[PDB]
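Repro case for the chain-ordering regression, as requested:
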Amino acid sequence: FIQMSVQRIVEDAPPIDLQAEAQHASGEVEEPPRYLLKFEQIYLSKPTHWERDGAPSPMMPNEARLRNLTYSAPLYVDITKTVIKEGEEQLQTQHQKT
Amino acid sequence: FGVLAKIVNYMKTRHQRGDTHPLTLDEILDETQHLDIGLKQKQWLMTEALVNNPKIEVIDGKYAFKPKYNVR
Amino acid sequence: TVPKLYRSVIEDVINDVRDIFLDDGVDEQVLMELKTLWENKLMGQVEEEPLNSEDDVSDEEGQELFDTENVVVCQYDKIHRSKNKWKFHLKDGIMNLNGRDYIFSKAIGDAEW
Amino acid sequence: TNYKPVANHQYNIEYERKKKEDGKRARADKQHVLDMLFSAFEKHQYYNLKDLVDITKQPVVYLKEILKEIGVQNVKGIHKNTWELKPE
Amino acid sequence: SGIVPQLQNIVSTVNLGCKLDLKTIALRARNAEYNPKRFAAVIMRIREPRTTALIFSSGKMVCTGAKSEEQSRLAARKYARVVQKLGFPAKFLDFKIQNMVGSCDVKFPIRLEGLVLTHQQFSSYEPELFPGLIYRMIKPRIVLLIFVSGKVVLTGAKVRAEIYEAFENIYPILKGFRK
Amino acid sequence: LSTMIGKGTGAASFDEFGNSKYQNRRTMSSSDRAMMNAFKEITTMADRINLPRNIVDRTNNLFKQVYEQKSLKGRANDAIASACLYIACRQEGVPRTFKEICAVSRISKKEIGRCFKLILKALETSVDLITTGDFMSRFCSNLCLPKQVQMAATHIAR
Amino acid sequence: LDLAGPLLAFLFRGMFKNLLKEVRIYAQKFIDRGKDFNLELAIKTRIIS
Amino acid sequence: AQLKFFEQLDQIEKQRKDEQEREILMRAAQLRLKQKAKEMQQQELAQMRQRDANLTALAA
Amino acid sequence: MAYQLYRNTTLGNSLQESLDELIQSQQITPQLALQVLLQFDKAINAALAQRVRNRVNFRGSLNTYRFCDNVWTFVLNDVEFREVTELIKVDKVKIVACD
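-- result from build under test --
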């Protein structure tokens, strides 16, 4: 599951395509920008518990049993965002380990 | 055509004056700061189209008596 | 330099007015005559309502009436002022200083009030 | 690195800069606004108030007052009750 | 205490009693500016009193920048006279000082932490938002900006007596927290 | 004091063109819907920085008090929620910087601070002044510094 | 026999689809306004967990 | 003047040919109608653009 | 119906005087003269925007300023127009700006 299925589920999902609804009522020759998001390269951290202070710390299983915590691990995905504003330039910013 | 609706508003204020008299288009166009050229002719084609639906009454002869109910 | 820019402007102006001269039906000789003439011409008060208690609280207004001194006409992109000083990002424009004309693209100015 | 502390989000500062540069729409004189409205109506017969505000570039209250002076709202099967720029 | 605050800015509002044409005023006045897209009033400045006034079409004017009450009244009268010279029936009606700002120094560093601890009901110290402590005095409705360097700025006063009284009230308190 | 209806079975539930549940259920009032949306936003913001549920509940109570008090009715909801979250963190003894709250809220730092002042005035309460030791644990852990380094930094700042 | 892996894969399929749906909605609002939405804010972390 | 009337009739033939010689190009991929529509759109801009001229002359 | 800035300069004044002479001679109609002025304004704006690539500087003191309809009317005194190639001194200047 973790090694293959999670990554394959992330990759199988179609890229998100978004555009404005003829904003500004101008000539509107594809003027509304197109935003494209593609998820990639899922990362999992070791099980971690964040305290009331907000300081991350490893979560041992027995501590989870005693304090009624849930044994879970953070899940991170790289996301690539492309902006197409029909300005003849497309910018593909990348967000790492979201 | 928009200037035409503006002329309609002008004659509406003319009714508001109460001095409504049989008029024509040239004097209104002059007093509203507009000229008399073939533009007046195309806008007069539009104006006759208006005379086909002039709920604000614009007749050709002695005219402009808009209000369907009008006594004073 | 500036005269050469002026000649280029002449060419642009004549080219730009040719189409209007065709649209209005006027003969083209008008443009030639215009260029010839243009070149030749160039080369305890409790009751405080009365404000008359103060006088000579203004300055001479004839400067703006005269306008004979040097004049700069341009376009402004940014104009900032911080409590004493006026700052000027004036873009491309023209200047008339001592009759001689100056041409510029970026103009930066600092003045005091 | 996620959710790093930022004083203000980048998109918000860009939007605020654009809005500040544009400024608020100014209340122009009645004559010019009326002339622009009449030309707009000349384009074709029916206008919605939102796009009419965009066309006129006037405050919504002032434009609504001027439009109530001459134009009239008609309830219609297009989508909804909209303004009519014909004075009658 | 031996220290008296000195006024740095005074805000006064006066009604001219007549409607005005902002565009005409902008075109004809000397130092006036009018940007209806930016602000709905006309901003004018006079150097001799060293003040700035905002003039509205309703006939009400606000004068700021004056260091003294007399300077504020004289500047407001000068602005009204300038508008009157432009042909309008400008008058001088219900002139009033809406706000006064004063500044001073206590000449010693202050422990704002102890001050906010002692007067938490009136104090507000947030270094993230603003390094100066904000004190809201009650008996005079004055807001005081107290700084670790000792500078104190008072605002919200209608009369100079309020400024002086507020400083007189705050000085022993600050003396109690001298660093 | 409400209920809601589902699809049920497949027969007369859907009618001429799929009427569904005769309707859509359409429940409640704005004085509760706005508070509900604010609670959802608060939970989202807290989970963004892994805040504990007790701080979330304190934020919810603070927002309820502010919203019913109504001195901040003119301020946009999200700003009130963010300022309430900041105040709850301060009261619980684990303060987050205004920038840290802005990182997880769409509201800018300036608006968050203004709403924070207004909420303090409306509640007639106060928050203890932050100290350098409050942020040492989180800052050092996020920097992955050793415990001795964290102790040294805390001692140096104090 | 469906063990732990396939069952959790089914659930994660559903929840990741929901997460992308929420990102779509949240970003569409801001795009209509013309603001350049932040991806980190769009992601609702609570959904999957 | 009679010759100028004949030239105007020739310009009318030239506009008909241009409008119809391609009311056909559009079909192969109403030209006059499109031109009229384009002319209608400018009117609003022209005046919004134009009265600024009147105030700028007053300003300067 | 344009920006209409350079009309009140040497170039615009010469063009206007020439148009006045032709109008006196009946060679051109006033509508044609106005059209010529409009076309000149367009051409001059484009020419200054495109063919000018020099950066200038100036300093001084300000005595008056005005703003209306996006039109600045600054009035400076004792201005020093400094350029890398030359320096010019002027006792008074009026800067009219638009956008």
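Ordering looks correct now. The helical segments of chain G are 4-33, 39-42.
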